[PDB]
């Protein structure tokens, strides 16, 4: 059974940083991309970026709204995903989803249940 598991989220002081975990199982991790999608309360889903598969050498891409702030990398030995957030605003206060991704379907086929991050003093 495919499983995605986000964690590490809590409350963060503004200007600060938190690291997110994505743990998976039930498929061959390295063949797929992994994306991070977030959602602020009552707003739309916003893609943040992805990290490519083995074929692509596990390279990285981001959206313009977090490029330079956020950092994606992967634990292929453990099939774990990570997101490094920095210089955090309340506009980063949200639920963070890791999603299986790639060029097979060019869509995000499996998601976790998410993690909440709340930025506040």
């Amino acid at each position: 059974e495919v499983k995605l598991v986000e964690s590490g989220g809590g409350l963060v002081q503004p200007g600060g940083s938190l690291r997110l975990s994505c743990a998976t199982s039930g498929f061959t991790f390295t063949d797929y991309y992994m994306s991070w999608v977030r959602q602020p309360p009552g707003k739309a889903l916003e893609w943040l970026g992805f990290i490519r598969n083995k074929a692509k050498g596990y390279t990285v891409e981001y959206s313009a709204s977090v490029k330079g702030r956020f950092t994606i990398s992967r634990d292929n030995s453990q099939s774990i995903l990570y997101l490094q957030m920095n210089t955090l605003r309340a506009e980063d206060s949200a639920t963070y989803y890791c999603a299986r991704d790639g060029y097979y379907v060019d869509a995000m086929d499996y998601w976790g249940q998410g993690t909440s991050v709340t930025v506040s003093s």
């Binding site: 994306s35 999608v37 739309a44 889903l45 916003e46 893609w47 992805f50 891409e61 959206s63 991704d101 060019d106 869509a107 995000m108």
Partner: peptide, 12 residues
Amino acid sequence: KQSYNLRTFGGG
């Protein structure tokens, strides 16, 4: 959601 260039979610 477009996946033509990176990814971009619609508003819903």
